[PDB]
Amino acid sequence: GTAKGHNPTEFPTIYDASSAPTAANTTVGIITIGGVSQTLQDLQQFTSANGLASVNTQTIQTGSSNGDYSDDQQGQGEWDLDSQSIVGSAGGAVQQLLFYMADQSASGNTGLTQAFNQAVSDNVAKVINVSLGWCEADANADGTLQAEDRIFATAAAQGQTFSVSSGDEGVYECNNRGYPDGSTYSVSWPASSPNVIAVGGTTLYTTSAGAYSNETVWNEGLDSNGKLWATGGGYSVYESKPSWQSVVSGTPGRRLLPDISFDAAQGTGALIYNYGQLQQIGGTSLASPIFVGLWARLQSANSNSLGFPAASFYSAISSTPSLVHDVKSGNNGYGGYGYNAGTGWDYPTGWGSLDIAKLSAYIRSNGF
């Protein structure tokens, strides 16, 4: 297999989703910080270049009508990654793409919080992407965790699926966002919520013919600043273990994450239009929108009747290994520290990535 960049329109082939319906019957949301004006131009470039019908979008100011929803330049790259990867993974069609924009002028983390809140309150997107996060302990310290967890709990009860990137700092999330720290491990919020699907990162290898070859842990080592680039994973120090995670024996009574993983290495990342220019982008910021697009296809295949799927993922995958590509090689730390991949669920990558047609078959037979 291999390592190379990929048009996101290739992810259905890679994850065995070509035979499923598109997300044409499912509305998808994306949480952003600030506006998406350039992102929408880049999305038009994306759909036109690929010869696809245009995507129906809506942008939503989730806070004050006088809030700051101007474009954040770097943020455009994120909303580009998310939107193009979702539409690609979805087979080139979603019913509507909703950008839930956080006010940038609001106090503390309240803009982001109100963005989550709006998506849950409106309850129109079935699946919502969150390619963001930070040290759960910081979020815990200022009350943001507790506030946001209530919103996500509502989501799950409503049958919405929030998908959250697990982080890009490996085990060193709380050490100044990814500086190596020995045996001191931490995790990201909101991925550590038991009310979201946490999505980790892989190194994706494909055959010359573009088929799936294999996946290892995403760990690209240190950048020039000395920061680790690797898939977030471990367990929450605050959140209790939801009962469905009991199938992973020998772990603490805490929320383990991630749940599943998809492509995240920059070296095997997505080719994304950003301010009109193609760039090769990775991170768990990539992995999460891939999941969102694929899961939105299964929703469309199931009349958007699939509820919050965490429990079903754990029961089904633990009893049915063929539903996943099980990552077995690599680690998410540095210098010999960190968690190792292995057979079955592991801390770097969870269950690994989904084989979509096999999961669809499972759902047809068993529900979810």
Which of 166, 177, 81, 138 is closest to 348 using CA atoms?
Answer: 166
**Residue 243 is among the residues annotated as catalytic for this protein:** no
281 φ, ψ (degrees, to nearest 5): -125, 140
Q: Cβ 324 to Ca ion, closest distance in Å?
A: 8
Tell me the two tokens of residue 293: 């697009």
Q: Cβ 110 to Ca ion, closest distance in Å?
A: 38
Catalytic residue among 16, 42, 80, 82: 82
With beta carbons less than 8 A apart as the criterion, state whether 94 and 87 touch: yes
With beta carbons less than 8 A apart as the criterion, state whether 139 and 192 touch: no
Q: Is 326 in the site for Ca ion (CB under 5 A)?
A: yes
Q: Is 259 in the site for Ca ion (CB under 5 A)?
A: no
Angle at 196 between CA 110 and CA 325, to 5 degrees: 140
Span from 4-12, 70-78, 316-324, 325-333 in contact with Ca ion (CB under 5 A): 325-333
DSSP track, 319-349: H-GGGEE---S-BSSSTT-S-B--SSSBTTT
Query: Residue 222: exposed, middle, or buried by beta-carbon count in 10 A (0-12, 13-18, 19+)?
Result: middle
**Residue 70 is among the residues annotated as catalytic for this protein:** no
- 329-358 residues near Ca ion, rule: CB under 5 A: 346
Q: Which is nearer to Ca ion, 42 or 346 (CB)?
A: 346
Tell me the two tokens of residue 50: 């690929």
**Residue 83 is among the residues annotated as catalytic for this protein:** no
Kindly write out the interface string for residues 278-317 of this chain, putting x where it contacts Ca ion by CB under 5 A and - elsewhere: ----------------------------------------
Q: Tokens 């992995």 label which residue?
A: 287
305 φ, ψ (degrees, to nearest 5): -95, 0
Q: Cβ 201 to Ca ion, closest distance in Å?
A: 13
- Please state whether beta strands 161-165 and 127-130 pair in parallel, antiparallel, or not at all (unpaired): parallel
Interface with Ca ion: number of residues (CB under 5 A): 3
Span from 106-114, 148-156, 163-171, 326-334 in contact with Ca ion (CB under 5 A): 326-334
Q: Is 346 annotated as a binding residue?
A: yes
Q: Is 72 annotated as a binding residue?
A: no
Q: Cβ 146 to Ca ion, closest distance in Å?
A: 32
Q: Is 327 in the site for Ca ion (CB under 5 A)?
A: yes
Q: Which residues are annotated as a binding site for Ca(2+)?
A: 326-327, 342, 344, 346
For the annotated catalytic residues, the residue numbers are 78, 82, 285
Residues in the site for Ca ion, rule: CB under 5 A? 326-327, 346
